[model samples]
Target: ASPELRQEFQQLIQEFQQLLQEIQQLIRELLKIKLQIIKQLREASEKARNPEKKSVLQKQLELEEKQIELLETLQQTAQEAQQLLQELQQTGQELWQLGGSGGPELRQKFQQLAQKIQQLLQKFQQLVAKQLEDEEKFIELLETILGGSGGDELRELLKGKLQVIKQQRELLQLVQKAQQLVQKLQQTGQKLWENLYFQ
Candidate 1:
């Protein structure tokens, strides 16, 4: 294929892959959110007295429903992205391994792939930044809600719960790095293809 065609193909493949990955990450995050909500509900349920039982139960139901909705949306998006990625991969595969002949073509493709990988690295950085911001907001909300509790046990339980959010951010960082590697490989492949066509 011509250089321009290969470039277009490369972009399409990378973008599709990026979307697929973001959806996957989002699904995992939704799970974390669900678990955190479930923990909060359990705490809320335990503290409910007979007088407040109805109200507490109602709030719990709403939270559960919201969590379920998030999960469903996550699943739906992930499935769609996966299908799109598969389609893109099939099309890209039909193109030459290196524009038809010389090894020089491989270098150009690898470079294109590198740039795409860097784009995703930047994306990972943004995600981590967002995670930190979100964790702080969640911590503040929990403190405001439960900071006034008189019992040591209640205070400790809430603290423990908030700690879980911090742990999640840390875990997510680790997973993000792993995903970053996959993006790097994609970029490498694209760079090789670009070099084959242009160089």
Candidate 2:
């Protein structure tokens, strides 16, 4: 590859590698936050032997609920995107690991990278990725409020969005073709990798 083109390809691979790790780290942080909130909610409700403490707990829980509500939006988006994300994480790891070494080392690794590129193309081209059917998966934004009146709004928001979102299997066929085209890119990239840097 030309100087600029090789730089761009390596950068793209780095982004892919970093994004998967970043999202995994973020997911763990969200889970930890929720766990602590649940423990505090328990403290407020059960061990709250004082009315004053109870009130403070409620206020604190109320504030925490908003944090969860915002996180819920990203959580839902993550789950929806997860189907695609999981596919790439599994199938494209090899592809992303390709361009990360110094020039001479990367040139040596192109054989390995070229094999990965070919394999990745076949994986997607064969529709080896997971299939999805239209279904609503419910996630509780605030389990802390489940027994209280606050439960209603959180559940309602999820239902409202679920009903309003369009079903897009109609567009999935085009996306199916889109994946096919991506396979072409991988196949082409493999050829270029071999031709350019096999020096």
Candidate 3:
């Protein structure tokens, strides 16, 4: 692995986990505020002496109920998003711990290739192994492994991470939008709650 690539991956994993946690926190906070408003709205609706005031509070209650539905969706999204984050974090750690993919795998193949080449040398000490027989078979395997396949495999792994990065970034944008929506609705709910309190 490139030194900088690992660094970027580590940073991305940390930042992603933090962002998801922040979203979770924001959603919970918003949920609390919404419930608070709904509770107060219920009391106000029941206590209203004027029909008009009761009707207005009832309307607010309906809106809050719908908002609760939206929050439930947001909550589900955040929960599943966190589940993905967990998988990503595990993959990140494994990739980091596993070290350079091509390098490590290539080393193994190179060693095996070296050992076989040596055995071929030993067989030469007897009388060279026939080119059409075991010799050709070994060379065939050798050529295939040396075909530099591991490089692309490493590239593929990196590409996988890059795609995940893009996907999670888009999800973060959604979380941010939901966070803002939560705040806006919280304030709106509070607006009417405050009015009823004063009344």
Candidate 4:
């Protein structure tokens, strides 16, 4: 809460936020790869719907399974990150309380824990924001790909509806979460530090 401690906490949060950005890069790469795989499977399925080849369906199934696995892994990591953050919050709150009716080295140690939590949440928030951006791009790419190039009024109308659906999904997904998470992270971080020092 002291100026020195606030500076230290800010540095830690910034570093953690950078790590979160790295995580977002990884997730975006994963998502992009998955999207490519989906495109491949769709093409293969369209091909395989005819009576000719076992390999087409097999390959398509393989791609679908791989995409599912990657999605599952991402989901698992998100869940783990969320759980870790909650734990960090609980521990940080306890450490803050243990600052007790005095001030000294123990207070310094608790401040360090607080710094760690702040860093973790900052990282998580940064990653979430980046993921949302990537997802928006992904949705746009999907619309362009799926809607194709016909300028027919009927086709254009249908494409418009499809675009709306894609946009809705993206909005509900990463965008909304990203907005809420970043706001909450900032508010929580602000209050936590304010209490630690300003109070």
In candidate 1, how many clashes are counted?
A: 18
Per-residue lDDT of model 1, residues 1-199, tens digit only: 5676567556656655665666466557657665665665566656645434435334644645554564465455446545544543543454454245646534444445445445544554465456446546645644544433334433664565466556546545544653564465465455435544554
Q: Least accurate stretch of 10 residues (summed lDDT) in model 2?
A: 128-137
Flag regions of model 2 displaced more than 4 Å: 1-4, 76-199
Higher-ranked by TM-score: 3 or 4: 3
lDDT accuracy of residue 74 in candidate 4: 53
Residue pairs with backbone atoms closer than 3 Å in model 2 (clashes): none
TM-score of each: 0.45, 0.33, 0.45, 0.38
Write the residue-wise lDDT of candidate 4 on 21-50 in tens digits: 454555565565555545544554454433
lDDT at position 99, candidate 3: 45
RMSD of each: 8.3, 12.4, 33.4, 10.3
Ranking by lDDT: 1, 3, 4, 2
**lDDT scores for all predictions?**
0.52, 0.42, 0.46, 0.45
Lowest summed lDDT across 10 adjacent residues in model 3 is found at: 124-133
Model 2 per-residue lDDT tens digits across residues 1-199: 3555555454544454444344435544654645464454655455455555456446546654564554445444334433443343333333334544324443344444434534443442233122112112212223333434434443453343233223223223333443443444355345444543544
Off by over 4 Å in 4: 1-61, 99-168, 175-179
Clashing pairs in 4: none
Candidate 4 global Cα RMSD? 10.3
Give the range of the ten consecutive residues with the poorest summed lDDT in model 1: 145-154
